[PDB]
Design a protein around this ligand. Structure first.
Ligand SMILES: [Ca+2]
Length: 313
């Protein structure tokens, strides 16, 4: 095959926020990634007649934008013609944030071939880290580049002693990969009982993927809830995580034997759906402290095959 990025022409390119939340102060539409929104990429295209089966073309996504929803994008990506046949089979590489498509025999079925597509998309959370910030969302389809500014707000309320979000949903097993932030305000406690209770999911203790990281720098609390754990101090083995209710409940005393603590923590967990008929469910967190019990909750909805997530106190 040949690279035919110069022979596949995209037009009417747009990035939508679905549904989008209007900021009642500025009047602008925002992307509230932890209040059920996703992005959508849409375009029409034409294909020169010299293109043949096996020729390739790319969608290159920019540093703040990726395909997928709360659920990470599939490695395999089909593009369908208006008749419902697969015109191109794609391979998405997360390291290069690029899908390479290979045309099928269907590109040779007709002359003057024309198609369109709508693809769910999202912020690249490890890069678009910060709330209430406009990010250039960019894509190059073939050789056609498009971008628009999208204000992202993940709702990381820094004054809250307990807040949690879905980091991502795994595309292969539909597991919820969670991030909870404990003590962003850096208060001092003598009691700190951290409880997670799952509805529709279970933990797997033997997988050793309930992780506790001690924060040493306030910037580690990225608003996107996708922190770079490779840079953090992994203190998990210092704590006793107690499972109950057939692995639906996890309890940990974050004081770990100390009389007083103003330590701050990032906690990551993996919650597996009970079965393959649905991945809906709910995750409830509580932090019981000296004089206050804090609560945060996470819920999900599937919309036309994209995963959406909502967190709330
Ligand atoms: Ca738009």
């Amino acid at each position: 095959g040949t690279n035919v990025n110069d022979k596949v022409h995209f037009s009417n390119i747009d990035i939508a926020i679905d549904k989008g939340h209007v900021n009642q102060t500025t009047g602008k539409t925002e992307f509230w990634a932890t209040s059920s929104d996703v992005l959508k990429l849409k375009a029409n295209y034409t294909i020169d007649d010299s293109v043949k089966e096996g020729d390739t073309f790319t969608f290159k996504y920019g540093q703040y934008f990726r395909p997928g929803s709360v659920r990470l994008p599939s490695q395999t990506q089909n593009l369908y013609n208006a008749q419902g046949n697969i015109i191109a089979k794609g391979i998405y590489d997360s390291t290069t944030n690029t899908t390479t498509y290979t045309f099928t025999n269907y590109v040779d079925q007709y002359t003057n071939v024309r198609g369109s597509f709508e693809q769910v998309a999202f912020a690249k959370r490890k890069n678009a880290t910060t709330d209430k910030t406009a990010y250039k969302m960019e894509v190059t389809l073939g050789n056609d580049t498009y971008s628009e500014e999208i204000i992202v707000d993940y709702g990381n309320k820094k004054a809250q002693p307990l807040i949690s979000s879905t980091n991502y949903i795994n595309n292969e097993d539909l597991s919820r990969n969670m991030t909870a932030y404990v003590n962003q305000p850096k208060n001092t406690y003598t009691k700190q009982t951290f409880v997670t209770n799952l509805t529709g999911y279970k933990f797997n203790p033997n997988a050793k993927n309930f992780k506790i990281y001690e924060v040493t720098d306030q910037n580690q609390f990225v608003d996107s809830f996708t922190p770079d754990t490779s840079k953090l101090k992994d203190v998990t083995d210092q704590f006793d995580v107690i499972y109950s209710n057939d692995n639906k409940t996890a309890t940990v005393d974050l004081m770990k034997g100390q009389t007083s603590s103003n330590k701050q923590y990032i906690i990551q967990q993996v919650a597996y759906p009970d079965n393959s008929s649905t991945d809906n469910g709910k995750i409830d967190y509580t932090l019981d402290t000296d004089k206050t019990k804090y609560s945060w909750s996470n819920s999900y909805s599937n919309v036309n095959g994209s995963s959406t997530a909502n967190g709330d106190q």
